[PDB]
Design a protein around this ligand. Structure first.
Ligand SMILES: *Cc1c(COP(=O)(O)O)cnc(C)c1O
Ligand SMILES: *Cc1c(COP(=O)(O)O)cnc(C)c1O
Lengths: 386, 386
């Protein structure tokens, strides 16, 4: 992950001299948050998950919305993300959504993160940090009732239960939450695992003399919070849906568009090869648009000869493989095309739209694989309109 | 591409609190440059191609080597890259290796870039910029003899030849180079296209009254410079080989390693699912290492259930799919594993090595697709040893 999340919010002139960029619809983000809120029980609170620099959309540009919406909790993964969240002035709960090394946790003490622990050694390490800093650190215990087998303590055996109790009774730590995480969007499976989580967390609280009314039980990602409402419990952890990436729930549109522009227009006669490996040959006298975007910007090699882009409200085929820095598009039949015109790689333009499924099929990746790396590799412009 | 290339060269403490990082062997880079130089004719000069933030390895950390080695020319793609090169104090020739929009070219005037033009409109636009800035701008004309059909002017028709002459005779521009670029690593094809390039460039110079001895003819990328020596001409444009990514020439080892560390160690009984979509189930009582790296760091989803990583000098299988931020590895049979230990995702560790072909097969990407996005998504540490 980036060591530092740049403090700049790119302006129009800066975007104008960028090769490619992301356009983030702040209105759509606000709308998605408000829509999501409308479905939450009165007794659940929201922890907005902002890992991977807010799912590629950018923590620094989105935090003022999180604050204006009065969201009480934010989740992050890296220390750079924790810093960017606190630098926004956010003074609510900040949780880490993943296991973090001791070196990560120790360097972030000033940020008041509630770490996520699932092993005795993590508890021991944090207890020592607490001791050395003269404070009691707040933690969430991750349980494995969801069956992720990743961050949590599995309690299906005697040894696992014993380890769980050790975590939960560690001196110098305050257990403020107990959680799990679900691996699938199957509602029946989530309901069965939710029941098991309630059993496991109740048992653990009994064993460690924790008071239920002081513990935040939380299990729900975006899918679960909306589609298994009884799993909302004390707090929900929506990430993708806020950004409009919950594939089961298309009523939350994506907030991200990926754009470039036509650099140059080239006349190429019939029977001319295009691109590395000469994977395409013109079948007619052609006009090709040269776009200064390539796989190093996160537009994959596989897009060539498969994808279409939008130029002047019309679909144009990507021809030849995409190079490290350049993409070539056939604009032979597209009317009105000129250098400098905006090109949509993902998003809408006039009456045309590129679907998420289309992107996925062409890239042979899932959508977040695309957009998280778009976000590390391109500036974000926050559009505020409508 | 990034709008700004961070000015920091991460130190050990900063790396220690990063989740994942790249290790760049400066010694290997120096060695690769010196080895490459040993094969260049006395009359050719070197333009080190440093696009995509030096192929993910980082312009700012590598420029002092470029300068110490007395390389006279650097090539870049984005304006941010041009800035990073000039900010190193490099005062040699700076060329753009791709078509760039007018908005890009106009914003970069202070950087003294020699732009790369293949259309009349680009020539006209730059001539106007020259006029308005009271100077003569230096340009390279891209020709299509290589058959890339991307940045160049195709001269196989009368109209193409006429456009080429218009580019080459534009008032207020100084043609300092004429070039092409080859789409394949086939030496016989490169030789045939080289002959055609010599014919086309000679004709163009005659038509526009250009003086051969003042024009730099250049056609060779890494592959061509080493494997078709007669194509070295006046200047070569090596990128990949300097960084140790020329697949035909393994005698230039890769300068990049991708690393993380063990965050936590988890005991998971037999018949336990791991990861989203529960694509893996343990067949025995297991110990799993949780690594804080995932696809948002550029370690693809497809690595799960396919790849191995190196921990304590031994290979360990990645189990379940990689998530946005986390990777799980089976260390059940690995002896000596402890939290905090370094993990090699790509590179060498003790007697083990992960091959480029292995990476490619597992990720279902070509190597530069991986490393360019590693470079935008992780800090670089420059190792200076041996
Ligand atoms: C990312 C993550 C979430 C949010 O997941 P979405 O499917 O994007 O809503 C919630 N909890 C944890 C532990 C996560 O890692
Ligand atoms: C990237 C590029 C090069 C260098 O290519 P390698 O195969 O990495 O050596 C040379 N010329 C142009 C025009 C390029 O775009």
């Amino acid at each position: 992950a980036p060591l530092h999340i740049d403090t700049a919010l790119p302006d129009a002139a800066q975007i104008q001299q960028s090769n490619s960029w992301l356009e983030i619809s702040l209105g759509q983000f606000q709308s998605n948050i408000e829509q999501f809120k409308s479905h939450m029980n009165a007794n659940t609170k929201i922890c907005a998950i902002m890992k991977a620099d807010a799912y590629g959309n950018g923590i620094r540009g989105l935090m003022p919305t999180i604050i204006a919406q009065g969201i009480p909790c934010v989740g992050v993964a890296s220390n750079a993300e924790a810093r960017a969240v606190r630098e926004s002035g956010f003074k609510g709960e900040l949780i880490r959504v993943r296991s973090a090394s001791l070196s990560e946790m120790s360097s972030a003490l000033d940020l008041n993160i509630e770490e996520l622990i699932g092993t005795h050694q993590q508890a021991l390490d944090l207890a020592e940090l607490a001791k050395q800093s003269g404070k009691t650190l707040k933690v969430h215990i991750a349980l494995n009732d969801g069956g992720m087998g990743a961050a949590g303590i599995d309690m299906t055996t005697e040894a696992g239960k014993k380890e769980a109790v050790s975590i939960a009774t560690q001196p110098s730590l305050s257990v403020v939450g107990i959680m799990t995480h679900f691996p699938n969007y199957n509602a029946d499976e989530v309901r069965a695992k939710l029941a098991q989580f309630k059993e496991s967390s109740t048992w653990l609280m009994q064993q460690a003399n924790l008071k239920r009314e002081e513990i935040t039980l939380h299990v729900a990602n975006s899918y679960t919070a909306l589609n298994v409402p009884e799993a909302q419990l004390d707090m929900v952890r929506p990430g993708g849906v806020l950004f409009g990436d919950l594939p089961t729930n298309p009523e939350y549109p994506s907030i991200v568009s990926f754009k470039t522009r036509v650099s140059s227009l080239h006349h190429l006669p019939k029977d001319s090869t295009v691109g590395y490996d000469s994977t395409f040959t013109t079948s007619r006298d052609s006009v090709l648009a040269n776009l200064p975007v390539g796989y190093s910007d996160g537009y994959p090699r596989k897009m060539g000869n498969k994808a279409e882009v939008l130029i002047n409200g019309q679909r144009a085929k990507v021809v030849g493989v995409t190079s490290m820095n350049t993409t070539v598009v056939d604009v032979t039949e597209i009317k009105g095309v000129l250098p400098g015109q905006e090109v949509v790689l993902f998003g809408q333009q006039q009456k045309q739209s590129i679907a998420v499924s289309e992107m996925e099929n062409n890239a042979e990746l899932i959508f977040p694989e695309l957009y998280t790396l778009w976000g590390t590799s391109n500036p974000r412009f926050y559009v505020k309109s409508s």
